[PDB]
Each structure stands twice: as C-alpha cells, then as structure tokens.
Enzyme design. Structure first.
Site, PDB file in Angstrom:
ATOM      1  N   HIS A   1      -1.554 -16.285  22.625  1.00 26.36           N
ATOM      2  CA  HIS A   1      -2.947 -16.142  22.196  1.00 26.36           C
ATOM      3  C   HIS A   1      -3.166 -16.406  20.696  1.00 26.36           C
ATOM      4  O   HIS A   1      -4.322 -16.449  20.256  1.00 26.36           O
ATOM      5  CB  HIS A   1      -3.582 -14.808  22.629  1.00 26.36           C
ATOM      6  CG  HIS A   1      -3.042 -13.589  21.954  1.00 26.36           C
ATOM      7  ND1 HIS A   1      -3.309 -13.317  20.622  1.00 26.36           N
ATOM      8  CD2 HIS A   1      -2.383 -12.536  22.491  1.00 26.36           C
ATOM      9  CE1 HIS A   1      -2.765 -12.129  20.382  1.00 26.36           C
ATOM     10  NE2 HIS A   1      -2.187 -11.624  21.476  1.00 26.36           N
TER      11      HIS A   1
ATOM     12  N   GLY B   1      -3.565  -7.174  14.080  1.00 28.74           N
ATOM     13  CA  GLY B   1      -2.526  -7.876  13.322  1.00 28.74           C
ATOM     14  C   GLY B   1      -1.109  -7.504  13.765  1.00 28.74           C
ATOM     15  O   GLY B   1      -0.135  -8.130  13.335  1.00 28.74           O
TER      16      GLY B   1
ATOM     17  N   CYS C   1       0.095  -7.801  16.829  1.00 25.18           N
ATOM     18  CA  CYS C   1       0.570  -8.661  17.920  1.00 25.18           C
ATOM     19  C   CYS C   1       1.822  -9.430  17.531  1.00 25.18           C
ATOM     20  O   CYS C   1       1.946  -9.848  16.381  1.00 25.18           O
ATOM     21  CB  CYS C   1      -0.534  -9.602  18.382  1.00 25.18           C
ATOM     22  SG  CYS C   1      -1.973  -8.748  19.056  1.00 25.18           S
TER      23      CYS C   1
HETATM   24  C1  LIG Z   1      -5.732  -9.929  20.580  1.00 24.82           C
HETATM   25  C2  LIG Z   1      -6.557  -8.944  21.431  1.00 24.82           C
HETATM   26  C3  LIG Z   1      -5.985  -7.520  21.241  1.00 24.82           C
HETATM   27  O1  LIG Z   1      -5.786  -6.803  22.209  1.00 24.82           O
HETATM   28  N1  LIG Z   1      -5.687  -7.149  19.970  1.00 24.82           N
HETATM   29  C4  LIG Z   1      -5.034  -5.963  19.556  1.00 24.82           C
HETATM   30  C5  LIG Z   1      -3.711  -5.659  19.881  1.00 24.82           C
HETATM   31  N2  LIG Z   1      -3.085  -4.510  19.578  1.00 24.82           N
HETATM   32  C6  LIG Z   1      -3.776  -3.593  18.911  1.00 24.82           C
HETATM   33  C7  LIG Z   1      -5.126  -3.751  18.505  1.00 24.82           C
HETATM   34  C8  LIG Z   1      -5.846  -2.754  17.800  1.00 24.82           C
HETATM   35  C9  LIG Z   1      -7.138  -2.973  17.413  1.00 24.82           C
HETATM   36  C10 LIG Z   1      -7.775  -4.173  17.715  1.00 24.82           C
HETATM   37  C11 LIG Z   1      -7.122  -5.152  18.412  1.00 24.82           C
HETATM   38  C12 LIG Z   1      -5.776  -4.978  18.830  1.00 24.82           C
HETATM   39  C13 LIG Z   1      -8.027  -8.959  20.950  1.00 24.82           C
HETATM   40  N3  LIG Z   1      -8.812  -8.105  21.854  1.00 24.82           N
HETATM   41  S1  LIG Z   1      -9.106  -8.794  23.300  1.00 24.82           S
HETATM   42  O2  LIG Z   1      -9.630  -7.789  24.173  1.00 24.82           O
HETATM   43  O3  LIG Z   1      -9.873  -9.982  23.073  1.00 24.82           O
HETATM   44  C14 LIG Z   1      -7.495  -9.238  23.833  1.00 24.82           C
HETATM   45  C15 LIG Z   1      -7.313  -9.490  25.185  1.00 24.82           C
HETATM   46  C16 LIG Z   1      -6.064  -9.864  25.644  1.00 24.82           C
HETATM   47  C17 LIG Z   1      -5.029 -10.000  24.741  1.00 24.82           C
HETATM   48 CL1  LIG Z   1      -3.462 -10.501  25.314  1.00 24.82          CL
HETATM   49  C18 LIG Z   1      -5.194  -9.749  23.391  1.00 24.82           C
HETATM   50  C19 LIG Z   1      -6.438  -9.340  22.909  1.00 24.82           C
END
Ligand SMILES: C[C@@]1(C(=O)Nc2cncc3ccccc23)CNS(=O)(=O)c2ccc(Cl)cc21
Ligand SMILES: C[C@@]1(C(=O)Nc2cncc3ccccc23)CNS(=O)(=O)c2ccc(Cl)cc21
Ligand SMILES: [Cl-]
Lengths: 302, 305
Positions: B41, B143, B145
């Site tokens: 992603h 950040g 990820c």
């Molecule tokens: C990259 C993202 C994600 O989860 N970011 C974060 C990952 N870990 C912690 C976090 C904490 C605070 C904010 C964001 C976080 C973005 N949100 S999403 O629903 O579009 C989504 C949906 C699927 C996947 Cl594989 C990634 C994401």
C-alpha cells in the site's frame, strides 16, 4: 492507537555486553571504549568481604573477559565504589555515544537482561520509591544494565547486583553507588515498604483519555493539599507542584486540569474500578512517566 | 525471580530498518541482503484505498519512483515485484548488517516482539501475541506501517509479522513476510472489523504454572476436571477451547511443578468463577494470556520455589 509497556531499542547496548569471569564466578560486563564495568562482587567471601584485600591479591590475567567469541586482554584494574573497572587492550568499536546518569525514584528505564555476556531480553521498569526494581532476573544476570536513550545518546543508569528475599532487585548507578540502603554482601537486607508513584498513575490516566478510555472522568476538582491527604491514606507518594507542572502538556492536550484528574484518581482509590479496566488493566499502573506517555503518543525515534 | 513481559533484544532487527517513499507516502521497509520488503500500500493514495488495483498502480511505476533511505544513505532500487500484499524492492547494495534469519508464519496464541519504527528509525520494542481473532493489540501511530514482529531463539531472527493496518477498534492487522495477511483482512479500506476476541487458554495456564514456579499457590484447589467439562465452562467466559495438543505442550511445566494439566484447569475454572478476591498473580489482577508455554520455560527458573 494502543498503549504498551515499551522499552527503548536495545541494539546500542547489545554491542557493549561482555562476559566477565573471576575464578568460579561468571557474570556480565559493560564494555565502553577500553574499559569493562562490572559488579565488584565478581571477585564465603560474601559473608564479610574486604573488597580492597580481595582485589590486591588479583592480577590482570585472573580476569577473563570474553566479547562474543574473542578473548579481551585485561591490562589494568581499579574499583570505584561497588563497580570494578577493567582496563582492556582493545577499545570497543561499537561504543555508542553515552553518559552515566543517576536516576530518581519514579523514573523509568529499559533493562537488557544478559547471561554469560549474551543478551536474552529487554523489558521496561521503574525505580520504585523504596529504591528497588521489580525486575526479572535469574542467577548469572548480575552486571545486566538499565538505560534510557535521548536522541542518539545512551544514558546508562543501572547495573544489576542483587536479588532481595521478596524477589525484587537492587543495584547501582554506573559509578557504583547503590540505589537504596543496600550493601553488596550476604547479610539481612530487605525491601522497605513501597508506595505508588502518583505522578506516573496520573500520566497513565491521561494516556487512557488520549486512547479513548474516559469512563473515570468526573465533573469534580480538588486542592493539592486535600488530594495529598487521600494519597497518604492509600500508600501513594505525595504529589508536588513540580509534578503538576510536569503534567501541564498532557492536561492541555486532553482538556482535563491536573487537579481534575486528581479528583478522578481519588474516586478510583475510594470506590475501585467496579468491574471495569483502564488500558486493559484492573490495577492503577505506575510505571509510565509523563515523558513516556508523551513519547509513546507522538512517535519519537532513535 | 520475577516475571516480566519481556521482548527479544532488538539490535539484529534495528540494523535492517529502512525508510521507503513512493510519491507522498512514507513508511518502513525491512532490508535483508539485497531486498527491501514493505507493505504494497506504499503505492496507494488515500483515495486508492477504497478499491485499489495494485497490479494497475504498480505497472505505472519504475524503479526510480521508489526512494529507499538507510540511515543517511540513499539506496538504489534496481528491481521490484509484488508477492501477495508485500512489495519486494531489489536494491544495489546487500545489507552488511543482515542477520541469520527465516520467514515463519505463526498461529494465534503465539507471541513475538515488535520493533515499532517511524521514517525507518526504531522508536520502541514491546512484546505482543497474535490474538485468536488474528489481530494484535499493538501500539502504532500513523507512519508505523512496515514495522516488524519477530522472535530470536538462538542467533537466528524469525520474522513473523509486518504491520499494515489499524482497524476501527484500535487493534492491528498485518501479514507474514510473504505478504499473506493473518485473518480475513484485506489491504483495502472496506468494512473490516475485528471478530469477537477470546482469551488464549493455553497461555493463561502457562502463566499460572509460572506463578507456581515463582512461589505462589493460593489459587490451587483439591479438584480435577475432564477436558470436555473444562471446555464447556471456559467457553462461557469467552476462553478458547483447550485441545489435546495444548495439554501435551504443557507437559514439561506440569512435570516441573508436580501439578497435572487438568488439575491446573480445575484451578482456572475456579478463578473464572470467583475472581481474585483482592489478590494478584505475578503482580496482575487479571488472568494474563500473552505468555506461551515456551516463553514461561525460557524466562522462569528450572527450579520451582
Ligand atoms: C494505511 C492505513 C492504516 O491502517 N494506517 C495505520 C496503520 N497503523 C496504525 C495507524 C494509526 C493511526 C492512523 C493510521 C494507522 C490507512 N487507513 S485505511 O483504513 O485507509 C487502511 C486500510 C487498509 C490498510 Cl492495509 C492500511 C490502511
Ligand atoms: C550475587 C548475589 C545475588 O543477589 N545474586 C542474584 C542476583 N539477581 C538474581 C538472582 C536470582 C537468584 C539467585 C541469585 C541472584 C548472591 N546472593 S547473596 O545474597 O549472596 C548476594 C548479596 C549481595 C549481592 Cl550485591 C549479591 C548477592
Ligand atoms: Cl506458531
């Protein structure tokens, strides 16, 4: 989101751990530049040791220092308080930028537990008000160190020396001064009555608010003096104006005044959690400082 | 003596963390030999996340669109490929700090250390368990990820997790290092939610054996139980079923303490019924389930107190 008991990354400290052997005793040493630091008890003697008399009888070649699979050559030795300083013929190429710092009760640090000069685990802990630490150490862990990292500099604050009869631990700063009224000999020693680190419980309550756990908030406030009457009754450490000032940033981020959070803590002490938890805990957690909460809720890196 | 939630020393993993940037997105990568592994992603925008076509987004990229920074050094990307939900970036420099390693896929109940990172720089280390609902209760901000989970039994690092996502309840989801997600999750912003979670029964039993090893027996009782009666009761408290495999795995701890597995199951049944009555077990007022039988044997003394 999430809130974990988090330790500093240990790599900079792992590159300093060595094994020190003197006769039949084997323990851990910290190799920084051309000096290996270790508990002086590495040298029946524990019943009433005269460390200068025991030390004068040892030659440099009696101390065996092993760094990985390499034997280091000891070319000098001296004692500083309860720490032995072994001068070696090789400077540690992995020596990080470092300082020796003495911490106060309530302050937290990461412990890199080692056996035979080999790191086995890393965990976070706090210097209790009674100067002990609730560590996890087996025989052979002596010489394992505690530290914090500020930017790229490792601040070494603890070296493990002893386990007390209640299973808690005692040690020194890296200058060999013990934390607490402890001595490095086998005599009747015991942890004093401990208290809860009030400023840290308040910081952890602010961490719970930041993470969305707000059920314990109430409309009430309290004075610092009335709160301290409550704190004294539940074996909590007194809260000072310095503690109130230190919690200022967390108070501004959540919109909850420090004395307003004190009123929530008073109600939790007098009534309990009533079957509820805060950050997945049924006890009030006191091993996160205000700085730890700010750092974990902002992502500071090293 | 003592019992702490202990993580593996993180140095071997710190030497592998890098920053990966694709356009406006920055996250972490794992640099092992001449390959940087990161969540696919990184090639997505926030709009792309609703229904991303990763194959179509990736074909529009060249090697020079990926910026990889290791410390203060820029690495050159000379190839790229997608494997499941992970992007593999071939670089022109092999990591001189590459430890001895393996990629291992873990099962729910297993524990591991997480080295949380931001901008390719490690910030902290903590111990986690893969929950029965395939999520982890991590501590991750935006950040994070690409941060990884691992175990280091002996001198070999076994990488088992790479962070991808935070779900609406604040729990986390990710993949093994081959890019296969744990759980029914997708790297897509869809209606995704953690399933009802349960307590890891075999780990609670291991932690009760750890308490006995460290000198505490207040919770024991004179009873035993059948495995089926234990499961019928435990499922009423949202505890995972205990299998014969779990009973076999607890054999060594049972021999060290002299308490039969079904006798410890009887104690657990009583604890679920009564609570702790103002008491604690290993400094906890809840039944702890993020220590496996293997973790207890590794941390505790071989001599019971
Ligand atoms: C990259 C993202 C994600 O989860 N970011 C974060 C990952 N870990 C912690 C976090 C904490 C605070 C904010 C964001 C976080 C973005 N949100 S999403 O629903 O579009 C989504 C949906 C699927 C996947 Cl594989 C990634 C994401
Ligand atoms: C070196 C020793 C000690 O505490 N070792 C241990 C230190 N840490 C954890 C342990 C676990 C299990 C057994 C031992 C442990 C030995 N016991 S003692 O009372 O003679 C004593 C007295 C004073 C000092 Cl400064 C050290 C020690
Ligand atoms: Cl597994």
């Amino acid at each position: 989101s999430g809130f974990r008991k988090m330790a500093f990354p240990s790599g900079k400290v792992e590159g300093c751990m060595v094994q020190v052997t003197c006769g039949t005793t084997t323990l851990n040493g910290l190799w920084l530049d051309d000096v290996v630091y270790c508990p002086r008890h590495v040298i029946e003697d524990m019943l009433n040791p005269n460390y200068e008399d025991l030390l004068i009888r040892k030659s440099n070649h009696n101390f065996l220092v092993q760094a990985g699979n390499v034997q280091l050559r000891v070319i000098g030795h001296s004692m500083q308080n309860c720490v032995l300083k072994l001068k070696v013929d090789t400077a540690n190429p992995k020596t990080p930028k470092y300082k020796f710092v003495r911490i106060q009760p309530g302050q937290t640090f990461s412990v890199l537990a080692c056996y035979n000069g080999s790191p086995s685990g890393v965990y976070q802990c706090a210097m209790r008000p009674n100067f002990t630490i609730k560590g996890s150490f087996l025989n052979g862990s002596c010489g394992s160190v505690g530290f914090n990292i500020d930017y790229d500099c490792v601040s070494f604050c603890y070296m493990h020396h002893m386990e007390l009869p209640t299973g808690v631990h005692a040690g020194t700063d890296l200058e060999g001064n013990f934390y607490g009224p402890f001595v490095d000999r086998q005599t009747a020693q015991a942890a004093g009555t401990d208290t809860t680190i009030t400023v840290n419980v308040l910081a952890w309550l602010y961490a719970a608010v930041i993470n969305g756990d707000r059920w314990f908030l109430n409309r009430f406030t309290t004075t610092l003096n009335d709160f301290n009457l409550v704190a004294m009754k539940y074996n909590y450490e007194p809260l000072t104006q310095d503690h109130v000032d230190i919690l200022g940033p967390l108070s501004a981020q959540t919109g909850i005044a420090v004395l307003d959070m004190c009123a929530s803590l008073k109600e939790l002490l007098q009534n309990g959690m009533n079957g509820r938890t805060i950050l997945g805990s049924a006890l009030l957690e006191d091993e996160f400082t205000p700085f730890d909460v700010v750092r974990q809720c902002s992502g500071v890196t090293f």
